[PDB]
Structure 1
Amino acid sequence: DGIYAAFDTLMSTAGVDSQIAALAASEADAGTLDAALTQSLQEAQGRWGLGLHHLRHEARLTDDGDIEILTDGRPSARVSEGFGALAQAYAPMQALDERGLSQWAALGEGYRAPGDLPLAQLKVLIEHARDFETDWSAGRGETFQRVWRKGDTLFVEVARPASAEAALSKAAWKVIASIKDRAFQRELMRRSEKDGMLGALLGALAQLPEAHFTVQAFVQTLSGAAARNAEEYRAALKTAAAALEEYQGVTTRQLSEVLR
């Protein structure tokens, strides 16, 4: 179950407990496995902060027993090629500004409401518009928020962009601070002075998916009448911010564990 386990780690870098290997162990058929893979990939895309909401992300089993990742049904990458390869495949499809926020609109071509829109106007849009989308707006705790509705589903995205290097540095900091051996810790803190906690931990990388994917956002979804309710929108925004916090903490602790 090598490819299944690799997909499991790829999902775990986004805080997704896909359990794909366990599902394959239960003699699940190709369709059920593909549906689970696609659901996990969509969940992880909602958290990676790549800004590809305009594309349909799917994952399927191939004839040779591999897992293929596709965008809009177009073959994008395969797991056997490595996680860095899949990041390289995703890169040209992205468009990021200096803040790490996606410049693409989730609804594609069409009007986009300004990010500095007053809350009363946003309430009007929520209650009475058909489809709408807002640009990135500043939020609490150095985060950014936006919202868009497609059909009968309202998506609220809260993002704090973060490079993989920063998360690796934070995890290495925590790991170095948590070392029980005094002399070993003093040596690592000494090497850190010269090569960062990066070369401190490594001296004591691309294969690990955490070097390419880290949690940067979270998308919460409302459906039905809840999609047209301001109370539900605010509740979803709060839950999305809390989920971003929780999943970033989970991923940083997981990275610390894997570096230990």
Structure 2
Amino acid sequence: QTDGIYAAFDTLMSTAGVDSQIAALAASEADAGTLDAALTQSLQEAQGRWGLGLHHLRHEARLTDDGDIEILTDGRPSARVSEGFGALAQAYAPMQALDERGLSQWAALGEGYRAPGDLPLAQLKVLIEHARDFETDWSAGRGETFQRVWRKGDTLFVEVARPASAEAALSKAAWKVIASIKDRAFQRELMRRSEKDGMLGALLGARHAGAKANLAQLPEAHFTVQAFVQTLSGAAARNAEEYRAALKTAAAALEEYQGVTTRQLSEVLRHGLRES
């Protein structure tokens, strides 16, 4: 009932393109402090990619005596992996504050002044070079993306985000997955239930028993890639050239990981087609 938990964590992490390899690390008999550090590292990466908007909280995950993995924010028990992925998404929901574009409204640094996102590159240079902590608001970035930047202590953070809901991603991963099926009326009656209802709807109505009870386990229904944070440290975190390069890097990686998680999703969705 709490077994297959390392693998459950690994699958959650995969929806963010994080090959956390936690199961393998436990099979190698790694010490529990090691597993704890690895769980936390992966979760913080995933948090960099999920786009939920919670950089102002501390994200940890840790083993419990009863074989569970406990996820926490600012140290408060938020959820347990055994309670399922929908339960985790529900745990995060009240701590979010998304605007109309889906972008987070919270300041990464917390309460305080936020410089504009459109700032002239010379002004931003002065902030990078000579300020202590600082933070810009969202600005448009390229190809329907948005970007921002902030420095906490010794580390500069460059975030690039293109919000995209998880439901839609699932339905398009089911577009490819159905697309690979017999040209037949299962299709035409999914597609004619596309001019009437969402695609989990038409695919839970046109399928057989356990389509919903099976799919209610997928983490990809609650989590998907929407941003990418590239970090810099030390002298680089006060160098404007490094920041410009890091922005290029974060946009590139956004493209990459969106593609990669799409591929892994359609693959395992197609693994469910062979099983059927």
TM-score by length of 1: 0.93
Structure 1 residue 193 displacement after superposition: 4.6
Structure 1 residue 196 displacement after superposition: 4.4
Paired residues for 1:83-122 under 5 Å: 83-122=85-124
- Which has the higher mean CA deviation after the structures are superposed, 168-177 or 247-256? 168-177
Residue deviations 1:139-177, cap 9 Å, x none?
101000000011111000001111111111221222233
Structure 1 residue 224 displacement after superposition: 1.1
Structure 1 residue 70 displacement after superposition: 0.7
Which ranges of structure 1 fall in alignment gaps of 5 or more residues? none
Change (3 A) 1:49 1:58: same
- Which has the higher mean CA deviation after the structures are superposed, 96-105 or 175-184? 175-184
Residue deviations 1:213-233, cap 9 Å, x none?
111100000011111111111
Structure 2 SS opposite 1:194: coil
Structure 1 residue 182 displacement after superposition: 5.7
Paired residues for 1:119-198 under 5 Å: 119-179=121-181, 185-186=187-188, 188-198=190-200
User: What percent identity do the matched residue pairs reach?
Assistant: 100
Q: Which residue, out of 207, 220, 226, partners 2:217? A: 207
- Which has the higher mean CA deviation after the structures are superposed, 175-184 or 246-255? 175-184
Distance 1:84 1:145 in 2: 28
Aligned residues: 257
Structure 1 residue 13 displacement after superposition: 0.8
Structure 1 SS opposite 2:156: strand
Aligned to 2:41: 39
Task: Please report the RMSD computed on the Cα atoms of aligned residues, expressed in angstroms.
Answer: 1.7
CA contact (8 A) 1:159 1:216 kept: yes
Matched, 1:223 2:225: no
Residue deviations 1:124-146, cap 9 Å, x none?
11111111100000110100000
CA contact (8 A) 1:38 1:60 kept: yes
Residue deviations 1:84-141, cap 9 Å, x none?
1111111111111111011111111222111221111111111111111000001101
Structure 2 SS opposite 1:117: coil
Structure 1 residue 11 displacement after superposition: 0.3
Q: Which residue, out of 220, 236, 252, partners 1:242? A: 252
Structure 1 residue 199 displacement after superposition: 3.4
Residue deviations 1:4-59, cap 9 Å, x none?
01101110111111111111111111100000000000000000001111111000
Structure 1 SS opposite 2:62: strand
Structure 1 SS opposite 2:170: helix
- Which has the higher mean CA deviation after the structures are superposed, 150-159 or 169-178? 169-178
CA contact (8 A) 1:176 1:189 kept: no
Aligned to 2:82: 80
Structure 1 residue 178 displacement after superposition: 3.2
TM-score by length of 2: 0.88
Change (3 A) 1:180 1:119: farther
Distance 1:98 1:183 in 2: 38
